[PDB]
mmCIF file of C-alpha atoms in Angstrom:
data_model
loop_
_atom_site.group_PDB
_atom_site.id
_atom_site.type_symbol
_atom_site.label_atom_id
_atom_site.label_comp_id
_atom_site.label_asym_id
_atom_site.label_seq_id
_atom_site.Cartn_x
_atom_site.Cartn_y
_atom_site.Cartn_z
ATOM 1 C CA UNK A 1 -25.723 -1.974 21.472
ATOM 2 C CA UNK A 2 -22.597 0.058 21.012
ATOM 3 C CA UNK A 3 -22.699 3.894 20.746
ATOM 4 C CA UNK A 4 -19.738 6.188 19.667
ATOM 5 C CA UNK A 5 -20.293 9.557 21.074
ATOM 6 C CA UNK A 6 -18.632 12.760 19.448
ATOM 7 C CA UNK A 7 -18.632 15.914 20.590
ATOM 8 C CA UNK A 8 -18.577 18.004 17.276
ATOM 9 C CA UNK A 9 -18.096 21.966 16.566
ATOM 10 C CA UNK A 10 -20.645 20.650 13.828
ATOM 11 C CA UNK A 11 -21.790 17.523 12.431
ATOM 12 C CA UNK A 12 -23.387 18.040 8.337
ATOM 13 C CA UNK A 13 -24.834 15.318 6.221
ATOM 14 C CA UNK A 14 -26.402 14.729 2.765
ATOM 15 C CA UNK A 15 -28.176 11.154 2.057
ATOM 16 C CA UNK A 16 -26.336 9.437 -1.021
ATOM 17 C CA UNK A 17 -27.567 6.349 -2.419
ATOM 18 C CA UNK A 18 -30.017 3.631 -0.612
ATOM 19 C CA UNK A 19 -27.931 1.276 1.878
ATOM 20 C CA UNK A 20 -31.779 -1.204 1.918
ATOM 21 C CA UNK A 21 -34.061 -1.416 -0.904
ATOM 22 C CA UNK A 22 -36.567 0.226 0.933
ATOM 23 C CA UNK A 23 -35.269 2.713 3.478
ATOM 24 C CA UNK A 24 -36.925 5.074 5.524
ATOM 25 C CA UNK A 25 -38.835 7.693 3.246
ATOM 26 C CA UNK A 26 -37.693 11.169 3.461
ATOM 27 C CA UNK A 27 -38.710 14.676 2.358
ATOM 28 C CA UNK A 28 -36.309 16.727 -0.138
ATOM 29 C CA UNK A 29 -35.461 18.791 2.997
ATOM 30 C CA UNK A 30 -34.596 15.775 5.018
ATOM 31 C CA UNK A 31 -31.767 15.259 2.792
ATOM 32 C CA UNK A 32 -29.378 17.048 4.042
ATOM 33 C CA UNK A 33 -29.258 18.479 7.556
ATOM 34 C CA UNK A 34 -26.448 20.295 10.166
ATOM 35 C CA UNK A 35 -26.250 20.787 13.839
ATOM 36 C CA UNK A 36 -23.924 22.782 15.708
ATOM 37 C CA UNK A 37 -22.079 22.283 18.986
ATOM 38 C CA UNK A 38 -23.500 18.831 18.907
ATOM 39 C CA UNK A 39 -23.344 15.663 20.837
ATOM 40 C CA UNK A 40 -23.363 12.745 17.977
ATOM 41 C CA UNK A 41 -24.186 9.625 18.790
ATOM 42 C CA UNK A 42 -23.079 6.861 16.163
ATOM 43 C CA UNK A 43 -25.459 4.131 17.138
ATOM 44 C CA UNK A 44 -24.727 0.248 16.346
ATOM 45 C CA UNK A 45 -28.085 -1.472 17.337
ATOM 46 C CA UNK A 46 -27.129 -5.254 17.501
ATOM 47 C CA UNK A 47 -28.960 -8.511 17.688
ATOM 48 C CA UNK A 48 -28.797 -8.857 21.603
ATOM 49 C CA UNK A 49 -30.413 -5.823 21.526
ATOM 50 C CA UNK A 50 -33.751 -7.697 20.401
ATOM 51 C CA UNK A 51 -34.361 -9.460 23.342
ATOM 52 C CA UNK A 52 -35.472 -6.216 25.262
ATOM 53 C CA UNK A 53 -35.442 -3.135 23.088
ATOM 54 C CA UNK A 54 -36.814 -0.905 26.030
ATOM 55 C CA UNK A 55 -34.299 -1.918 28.724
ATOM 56 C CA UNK A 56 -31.106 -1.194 25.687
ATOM 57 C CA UNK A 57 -33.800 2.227 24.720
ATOM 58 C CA UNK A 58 -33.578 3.575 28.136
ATOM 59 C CA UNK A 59 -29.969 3.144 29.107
ATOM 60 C CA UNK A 60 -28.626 4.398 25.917
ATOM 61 C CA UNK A 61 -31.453 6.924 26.337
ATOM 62 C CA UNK A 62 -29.368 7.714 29.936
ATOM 63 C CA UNK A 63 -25.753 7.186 28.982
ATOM 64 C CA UNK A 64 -26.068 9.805 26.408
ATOM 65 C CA UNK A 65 -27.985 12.490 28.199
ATOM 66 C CA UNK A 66 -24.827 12.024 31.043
ATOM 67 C CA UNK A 67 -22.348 12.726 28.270
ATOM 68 C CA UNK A 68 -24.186 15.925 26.588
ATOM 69 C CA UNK A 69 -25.022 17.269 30.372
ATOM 70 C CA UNK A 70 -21.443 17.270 30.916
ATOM 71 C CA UNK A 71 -19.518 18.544 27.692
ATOM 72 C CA UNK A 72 -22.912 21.153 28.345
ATOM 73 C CA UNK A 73 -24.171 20.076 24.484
ATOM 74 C CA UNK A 74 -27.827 20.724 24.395
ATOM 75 C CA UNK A 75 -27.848 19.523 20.868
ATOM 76 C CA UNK A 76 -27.752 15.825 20.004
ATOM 77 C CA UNK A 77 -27.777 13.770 17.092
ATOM 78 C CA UNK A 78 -28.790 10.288 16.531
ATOM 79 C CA UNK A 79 -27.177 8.502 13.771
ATOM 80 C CA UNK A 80 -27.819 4.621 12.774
ATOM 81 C CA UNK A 81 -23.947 3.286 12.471
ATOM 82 C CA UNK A 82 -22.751 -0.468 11.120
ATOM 83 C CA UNK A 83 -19.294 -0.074 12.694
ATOM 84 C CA UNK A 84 -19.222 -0.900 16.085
ATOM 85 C CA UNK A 85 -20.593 -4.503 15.770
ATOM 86 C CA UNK A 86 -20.659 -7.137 13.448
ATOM 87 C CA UNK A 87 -23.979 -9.216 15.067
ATOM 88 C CA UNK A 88 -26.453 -6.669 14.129
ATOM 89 C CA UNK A 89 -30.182 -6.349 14.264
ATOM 90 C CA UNK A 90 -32.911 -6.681 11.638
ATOM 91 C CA UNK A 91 -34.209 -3.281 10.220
ATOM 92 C CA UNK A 92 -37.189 -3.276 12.377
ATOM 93 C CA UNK A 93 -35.203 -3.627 15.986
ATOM 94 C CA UNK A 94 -32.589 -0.890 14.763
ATOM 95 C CA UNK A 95 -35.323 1.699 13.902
ATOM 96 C CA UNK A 96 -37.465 0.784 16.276
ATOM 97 C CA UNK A 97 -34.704 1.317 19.203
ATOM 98 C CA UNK A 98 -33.443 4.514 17.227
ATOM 99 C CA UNK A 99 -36.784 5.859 17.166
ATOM 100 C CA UNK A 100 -37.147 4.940 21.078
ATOM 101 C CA UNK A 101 -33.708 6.661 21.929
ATOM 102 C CA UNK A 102 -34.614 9.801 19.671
ATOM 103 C CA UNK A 103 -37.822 10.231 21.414
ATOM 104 C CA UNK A 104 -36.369 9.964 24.749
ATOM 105 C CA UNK A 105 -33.667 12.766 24.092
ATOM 106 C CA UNK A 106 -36.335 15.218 23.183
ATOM 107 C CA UNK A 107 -38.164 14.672 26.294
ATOM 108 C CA UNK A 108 -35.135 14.644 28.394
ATOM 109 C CA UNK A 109 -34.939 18.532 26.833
ATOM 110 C CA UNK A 110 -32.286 18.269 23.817
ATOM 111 C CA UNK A 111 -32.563 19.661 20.576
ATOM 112 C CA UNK A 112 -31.974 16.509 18.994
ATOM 113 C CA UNK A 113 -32.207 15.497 15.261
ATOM 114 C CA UNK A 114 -31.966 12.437 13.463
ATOM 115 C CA UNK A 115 -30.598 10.692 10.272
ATOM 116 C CA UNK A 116 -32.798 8.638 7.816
ATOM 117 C CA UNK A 117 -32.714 4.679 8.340
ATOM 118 C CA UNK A 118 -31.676 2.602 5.486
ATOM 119 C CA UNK A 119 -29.135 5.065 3.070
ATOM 120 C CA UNK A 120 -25.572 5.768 2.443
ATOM 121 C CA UNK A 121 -24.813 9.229 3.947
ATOM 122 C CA UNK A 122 -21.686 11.320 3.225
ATOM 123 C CA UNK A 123 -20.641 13.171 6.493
ATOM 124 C CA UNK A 124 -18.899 16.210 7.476
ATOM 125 C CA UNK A 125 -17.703 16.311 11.332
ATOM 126 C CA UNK A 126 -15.359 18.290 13.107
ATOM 127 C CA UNK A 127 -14.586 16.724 16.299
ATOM 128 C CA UNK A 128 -13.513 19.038 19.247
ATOM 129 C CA UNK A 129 -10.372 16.977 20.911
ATOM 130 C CA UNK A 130 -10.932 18.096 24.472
ATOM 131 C CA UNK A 131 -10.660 15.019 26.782
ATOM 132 C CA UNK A 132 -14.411 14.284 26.932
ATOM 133 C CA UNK A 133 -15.057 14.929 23.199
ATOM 134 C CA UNK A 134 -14.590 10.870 22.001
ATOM 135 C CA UNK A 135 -16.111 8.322 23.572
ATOM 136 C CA UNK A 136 -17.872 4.804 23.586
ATOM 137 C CA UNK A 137 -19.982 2.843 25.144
ATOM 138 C CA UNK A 138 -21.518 -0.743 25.397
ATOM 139 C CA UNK A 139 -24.931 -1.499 26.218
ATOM 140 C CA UNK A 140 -26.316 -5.102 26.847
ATOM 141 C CA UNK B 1 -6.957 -5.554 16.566
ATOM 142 C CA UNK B 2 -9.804 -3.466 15.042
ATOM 143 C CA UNK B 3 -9.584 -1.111 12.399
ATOM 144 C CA UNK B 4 -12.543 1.656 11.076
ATOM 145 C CA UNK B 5 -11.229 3.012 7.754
ATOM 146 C CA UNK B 6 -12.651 6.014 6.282
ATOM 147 C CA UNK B 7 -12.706 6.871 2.255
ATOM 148 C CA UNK B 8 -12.524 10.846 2.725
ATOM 149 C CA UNK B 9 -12.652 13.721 0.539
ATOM 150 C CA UNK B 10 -10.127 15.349 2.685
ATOM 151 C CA UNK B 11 -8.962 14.995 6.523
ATOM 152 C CA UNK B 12 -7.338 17.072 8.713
ATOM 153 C CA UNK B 13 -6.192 17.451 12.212
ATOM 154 C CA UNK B 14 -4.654 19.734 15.265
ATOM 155 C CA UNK B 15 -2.833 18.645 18.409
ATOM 156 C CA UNK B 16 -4.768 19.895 21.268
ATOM 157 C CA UNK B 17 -3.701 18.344 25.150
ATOM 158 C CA UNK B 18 -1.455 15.494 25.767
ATOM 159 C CA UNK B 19 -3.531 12.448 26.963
ATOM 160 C CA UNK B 20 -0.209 10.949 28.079
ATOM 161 C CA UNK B 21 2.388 12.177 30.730
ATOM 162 C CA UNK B 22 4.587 11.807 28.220
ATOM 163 C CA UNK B 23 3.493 11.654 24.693
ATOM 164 C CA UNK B 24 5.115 11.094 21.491
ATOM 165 C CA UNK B 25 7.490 14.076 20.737
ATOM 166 C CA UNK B 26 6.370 16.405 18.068
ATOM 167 C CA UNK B 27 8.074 19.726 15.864
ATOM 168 C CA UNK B 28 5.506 22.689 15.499
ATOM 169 C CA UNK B 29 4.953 21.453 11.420
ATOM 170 C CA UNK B 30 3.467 18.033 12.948
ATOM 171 C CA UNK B 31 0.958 19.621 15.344
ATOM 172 C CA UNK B 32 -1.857 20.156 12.115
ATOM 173 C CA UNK B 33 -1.795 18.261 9.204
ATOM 174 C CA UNK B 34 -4.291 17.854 6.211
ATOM 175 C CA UNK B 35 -4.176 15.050 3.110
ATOM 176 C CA UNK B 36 -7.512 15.074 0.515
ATOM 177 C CA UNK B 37 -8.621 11.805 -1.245
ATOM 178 C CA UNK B 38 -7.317 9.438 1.624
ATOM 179 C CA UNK B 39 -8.257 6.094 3.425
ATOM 180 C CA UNK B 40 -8.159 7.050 6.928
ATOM 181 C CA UNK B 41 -7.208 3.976 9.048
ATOM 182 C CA UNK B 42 -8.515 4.576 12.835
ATOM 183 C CA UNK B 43 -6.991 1.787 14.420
ATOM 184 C CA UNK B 44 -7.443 0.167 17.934
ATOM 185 C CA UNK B 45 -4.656 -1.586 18.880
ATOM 186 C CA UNK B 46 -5.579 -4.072 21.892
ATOM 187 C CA UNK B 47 -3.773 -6.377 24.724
ATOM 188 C CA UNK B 48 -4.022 -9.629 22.590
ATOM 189 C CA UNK B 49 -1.921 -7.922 19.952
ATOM 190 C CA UNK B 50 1.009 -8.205 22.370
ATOM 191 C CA UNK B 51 0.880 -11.788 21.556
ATOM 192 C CA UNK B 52 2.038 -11.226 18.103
ATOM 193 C CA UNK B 53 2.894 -7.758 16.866
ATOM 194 C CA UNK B 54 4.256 -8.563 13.404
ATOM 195 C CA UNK B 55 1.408 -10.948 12.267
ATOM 196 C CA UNK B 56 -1.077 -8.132 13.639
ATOM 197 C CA UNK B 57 0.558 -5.606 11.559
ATOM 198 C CA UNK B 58 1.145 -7.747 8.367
ATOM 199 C CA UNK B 59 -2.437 -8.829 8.355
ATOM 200 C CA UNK B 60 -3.469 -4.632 9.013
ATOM 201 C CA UNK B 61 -1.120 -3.916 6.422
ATOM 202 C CA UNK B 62 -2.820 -6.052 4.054
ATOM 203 C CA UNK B 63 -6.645 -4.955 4.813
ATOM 204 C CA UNK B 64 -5.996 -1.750 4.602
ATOM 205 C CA UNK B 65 -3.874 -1.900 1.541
ATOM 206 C CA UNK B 66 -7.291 -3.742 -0.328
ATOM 207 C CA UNK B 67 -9.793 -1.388 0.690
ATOM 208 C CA UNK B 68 -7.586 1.237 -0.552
ATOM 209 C CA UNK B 69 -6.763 -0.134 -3.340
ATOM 210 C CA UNK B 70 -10.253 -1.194 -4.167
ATOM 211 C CA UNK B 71 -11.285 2.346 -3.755
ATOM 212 C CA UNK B 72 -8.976 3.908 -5.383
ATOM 213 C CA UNK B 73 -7.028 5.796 -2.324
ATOM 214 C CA UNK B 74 -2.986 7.009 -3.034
ATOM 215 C CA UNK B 75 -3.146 8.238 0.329
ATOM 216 C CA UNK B 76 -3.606 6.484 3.518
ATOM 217 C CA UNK B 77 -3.520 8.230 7.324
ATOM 218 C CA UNK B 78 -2.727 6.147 10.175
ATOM 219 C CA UNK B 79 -4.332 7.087 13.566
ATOM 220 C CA UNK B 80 -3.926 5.873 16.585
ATOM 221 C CA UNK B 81 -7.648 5.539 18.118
ATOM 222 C CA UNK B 82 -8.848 4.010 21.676
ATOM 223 C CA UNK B 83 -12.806 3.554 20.285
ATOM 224 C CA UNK B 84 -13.555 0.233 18.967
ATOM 225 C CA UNK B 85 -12.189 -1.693 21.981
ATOM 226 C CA UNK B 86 -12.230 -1.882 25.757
ATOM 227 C CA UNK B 87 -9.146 -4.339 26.002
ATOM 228 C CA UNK B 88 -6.553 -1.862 24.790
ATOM 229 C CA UNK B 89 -2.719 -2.375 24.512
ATOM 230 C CA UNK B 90 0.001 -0.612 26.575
ATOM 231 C CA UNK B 91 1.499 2.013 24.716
ATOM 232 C CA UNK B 92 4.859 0.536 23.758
ATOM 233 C CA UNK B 93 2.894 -2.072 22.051
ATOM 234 C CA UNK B 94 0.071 0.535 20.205
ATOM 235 C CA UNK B 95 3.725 2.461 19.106
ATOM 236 C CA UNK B 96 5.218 -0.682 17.609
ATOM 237 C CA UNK B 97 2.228 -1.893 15.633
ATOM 238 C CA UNK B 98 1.159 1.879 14.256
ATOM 239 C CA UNK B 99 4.932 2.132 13.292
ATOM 240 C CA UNK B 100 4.971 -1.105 11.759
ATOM 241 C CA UNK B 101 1.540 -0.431 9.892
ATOM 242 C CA UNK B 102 2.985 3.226 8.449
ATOM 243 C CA UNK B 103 5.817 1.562 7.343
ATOM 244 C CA UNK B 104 4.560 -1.055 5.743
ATOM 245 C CA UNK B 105 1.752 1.014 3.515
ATOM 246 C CA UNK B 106 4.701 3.176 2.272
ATOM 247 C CA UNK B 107 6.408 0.187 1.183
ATOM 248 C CA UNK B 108 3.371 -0.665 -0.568
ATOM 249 C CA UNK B 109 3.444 2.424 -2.175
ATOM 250 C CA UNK B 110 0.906 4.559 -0.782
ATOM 251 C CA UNK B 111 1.362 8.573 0.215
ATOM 252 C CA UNK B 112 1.062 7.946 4.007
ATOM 253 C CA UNK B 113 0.411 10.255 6.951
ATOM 254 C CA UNK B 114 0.763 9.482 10.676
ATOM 255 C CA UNK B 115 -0.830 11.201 13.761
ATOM 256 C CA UNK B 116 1.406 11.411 16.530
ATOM 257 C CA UNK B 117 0.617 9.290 19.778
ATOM 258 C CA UNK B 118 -0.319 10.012 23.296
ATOM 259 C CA UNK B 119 -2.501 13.676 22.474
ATOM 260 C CA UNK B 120 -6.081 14.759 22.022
ATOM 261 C CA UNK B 121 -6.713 15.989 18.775
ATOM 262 C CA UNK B 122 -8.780 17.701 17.073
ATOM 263 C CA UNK B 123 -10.521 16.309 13.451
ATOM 264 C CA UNK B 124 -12.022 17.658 10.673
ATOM 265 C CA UNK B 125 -13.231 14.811 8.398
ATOM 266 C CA UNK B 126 -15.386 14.886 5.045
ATOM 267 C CA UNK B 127 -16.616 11.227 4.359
ATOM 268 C CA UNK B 128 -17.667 10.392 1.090
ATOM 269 C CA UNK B 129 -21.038 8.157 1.750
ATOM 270 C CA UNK B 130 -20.497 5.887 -1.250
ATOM 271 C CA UNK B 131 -20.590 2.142 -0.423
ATOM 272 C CA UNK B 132 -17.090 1.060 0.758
ATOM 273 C CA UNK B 133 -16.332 4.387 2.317
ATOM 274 C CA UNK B 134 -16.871 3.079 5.825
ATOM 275 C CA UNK B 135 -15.755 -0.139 6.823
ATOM 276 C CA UNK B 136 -14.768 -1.808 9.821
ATOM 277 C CA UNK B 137 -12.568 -4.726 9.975
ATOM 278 C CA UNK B 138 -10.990 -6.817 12.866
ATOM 279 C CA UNK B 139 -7.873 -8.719 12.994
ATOM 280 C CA UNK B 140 -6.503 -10.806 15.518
#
């Protein structure tokens, strides 16, 4: 897996068009959403990343609670990304490991949200630029 | 070399900290900058570019120059960016290629912008969410 991590003033989407033919369903709320002084994670799940989905779930689980505790974010967002790999997993290992990494942000105590699997999203971000506020990481 | 390029309604920027000792000089007018309906070119430049700067930058050139001229981009921004690669060139080599890559898109025509090198900044980007309007490409 590789995860881009972005330390954002505030990170805004709204779900375009439909990236699978049949993505993740979604309410008319969960169509657009915003965060605020937010730790994004941009999350390429890849197809190493099938061989153990927990072991790749719980370090990426760990690498990005170390990041929010120290830019002090308590919010975090999980976003499925294509761009930091090109060897990526099936639909069902990438939402299954976003899922996994989601669920173990909200019980490490975040206020965490999550896009939709499956669509085209437009994106608004404004990135801080402090030295900590862009970052990446690989996870195998 | 590897390249994220961004189809954005509109991006914009501010110099924060120098992430160099000593960065690229800069006038007051080139500390924020803004351009609307642009291809933003992040752009990694890494140690096995060293081998071959020109090739490197013709073949970025080129890439870029089709996606934006697929979607329909006048303007292009050229950012230096240390995120899709953990083998990154020394500066004088990230300089050469970024130069090389802004001048060759305004040959091609294109309204370009540059970021300056060696700082942390700060970015404000709208991205459009239609299909080509994130794409990552590697060149080597």
């Amino acid at each position: 897996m590789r995860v881009l991590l972005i330390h954002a003033d505030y990170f805004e989407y709204e779900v375009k068009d439909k990236a699978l033919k049949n993505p993740e369903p979604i309410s008319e709320d969960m169509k657009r959403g915003r965060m605020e002084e937010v730790l994004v994670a941009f999350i390429s799940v890849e197809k190493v990343d099938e061989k153990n989905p927990e072991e790749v779930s719980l370090k990426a689980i760990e690498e990005i609670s170390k990041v929010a505790e120290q830019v002090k974010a308590e919010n975090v967002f999980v976003s499925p990304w294509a761009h930091l790999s090109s060897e990526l997993a099936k639909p069902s290992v990438a939402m299954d490991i976003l899922n996994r990494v989601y669920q173990g942000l909200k019980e490490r105590g975040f206020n965490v949200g999550k896009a939709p699997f499956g669509y085209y999203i437009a994106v608004k971000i404004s990135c801080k630029g402090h030295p900590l506020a862009e970052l990446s990481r690989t996870i195998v």
